[PDB]
Design an enzyme around this catalytic site. Structure first.
Site, PDB file in Angstrom:
ATOM      1  N   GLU A   1       0.742  -1.642   0.424  1.00 40.23           N
ATOM      2  CA  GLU A   1      -0.043  -0.295   0.104  1.00 40.23           C
ATOM      3  C   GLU A   1       0.664   1.379   0.383  1.00 40.23           C
ATOM      4  OE1 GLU A   1      -2.712   0.126  -0.228  1.00 40.23           O
ATOM      5  OE2 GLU A   1      -3.144  -2.245   0.268  1.00 40.23           O
TER       6      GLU A   1
ATOM      7  N   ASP B   1      -6.648   6.647  -4.376  1.00 39.76           N
ATOM      8  CA  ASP B   1      -5.944   5.113  -4.925  1.00 39.76           C
ATOM      9  C   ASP B   1      -6.266   4.738  -6.301  1.00 39.76           C
ATOM     10  OD1 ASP B   1      -8.895   3.955  -5.003  1.00 39.76           O
ATOM     11  OD2 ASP B   1      -9.126   3.600  -3.084  1.00 39.76           O
TER      12      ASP B   1
ATOM     13  N   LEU C   1      -9.033   3.745   3.147  1.00 36.83           N
ATOM     14  CA  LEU C   1      -9.683   4.131   2.426  1.00 36.83           C
ATOM     15  C   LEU C   1     -10.353   5.499   3.668  1.00 36.83           C
ATOM     16  CD1 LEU C   1     -11.689   4.637  -0.294  1.00 36.83           C
ATOM     17  CD2 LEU C   1     -12.953   3.277   0.766  1.00 36.83           C
TER      18      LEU C   1
ATOM     19  N   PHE D   1      -8.211  -6.576   3.872  1.00 38.92           N
ATOM     20  CA  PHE D   1      -7.862  -4.998   3.730  1.00 38.92           C
ATOM     21  C   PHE D   1      -7.977  -4.359   2.524  1.00 38.92           C
ATOM     22  CE2 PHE D   1      -4.665  -2.179   6.157  1.00 38.92           C
ATOM     23  CZ  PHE D   1      -4.677  -1.268   4.977  1.00 38.92           C
TER      24      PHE D   1
ATOM     25  N   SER E   1     -12.811 -19.610  -5.353  1.00 35.60           N
ATOM     26  CA  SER E   1     -11.778 -19.803  -5.168  1.00 35.60           C
ATOM     27  C   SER E   1     -11.165 -20.303  -3.904  1.00 35.60           C
ATOM     28  CB  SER E   1     -10.440 -19.022  -5.071  1.00 35.60           C
ATOM     29  OG  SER E   1     -11.051 -17.698  -6.593  1.00 35.60           O
TER      30      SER E   1
ATOM     31  N   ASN F   1      -7.929 -19.239 -10.919  1.00 40.58           N
ATOM     32  CA  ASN F   1      -9.097 -18.983 -10.989  1.00 40.58           C
ATOM     33  C   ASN F   1      -9.117 -17.210  -9.831  1.00 40.58           C
ATOM     34  OD1 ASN F   1     -11.524 -18.014  -8.613  1.00 40.58           O
ATOM     35  ND2 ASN F   1     -12.275 -19.765 -10.351  1.00 40.58           N
TER      36      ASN F   1
END
Ligand SMILES: [Cl-]
Ligand SMILES: [Cl-]
Length: 162
Positions: free
Chosen positions: A11, A20, A32, A104, A117, A132
């Site tokens: 990040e 972002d 965020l 996250f 998945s 996948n």
């Protein structure tokens, strides 16, 4: 390597409100702030989150505090989720970090949505799950970070980050 260091790589760290990849107002370590186009709605959220008048800027410490809350929230969300908890319980320590990373970044609801998945992971069918997971907007939008996460999931080692 641990979840904190892994996410800090993925990040980055920014002390000033920024946008972002999706164009949302963020600050610190992938925190965020709002999906609203208003830089003022972002500053407002920011001040509420920090408990002070920031004028869009925070300190390292502040960013780290948000980060600690976020990983914590990420973990508790997984453990509270009927879809996620079983997958997590079934995984080794490295892979657990990988699922936490996804959570996250895309929220619990988001990851909980990768039904197929999650089933493959639970069955420990690593290669197939890797394949996948790549068939997603996630992967198409942030390919380098997704590849790193997906590699951690497939292999159970931290190679992609070293
Ligand atoms: Cl907050
Ligand atoms: Cl990327």
């Amino acid at each position: 390597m641990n979840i904190f260091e892994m996410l800090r790589i993925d990040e980055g760290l920014r002390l000033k409100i920024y946008k972002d990849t999706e164009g949302y107002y963020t600050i610190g370590i992938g925190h965020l702030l709002t999906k609203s186009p208003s830089l003022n709605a972002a500053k407002s959220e920011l001040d509420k989150a920090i408990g002070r008048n920031t004028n869009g800027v925070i300190t390292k410490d502040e960013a780290e505090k948000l980060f600690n809350q976020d990983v914590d929230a990420a973990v508790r969300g997984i453990l509270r989720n009927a879809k996620l908890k079983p997958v997590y319980d079934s995984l080794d320590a490295v892979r657990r970090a990988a699922l936490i990373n996804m959570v996250f970044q895309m929220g619990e609801t988001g990851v909980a949505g990768f039904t197929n998945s999650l089933r493959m992971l639970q069955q420990k069918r690593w290669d197939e799950a890797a394949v996948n997971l790549a068939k997603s907007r996630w992967y198409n939008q942030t390919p380098n970070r997704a590849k790193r996460v997906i590699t951690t999931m497939r292999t159970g080692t931290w190679d992609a980050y070293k």
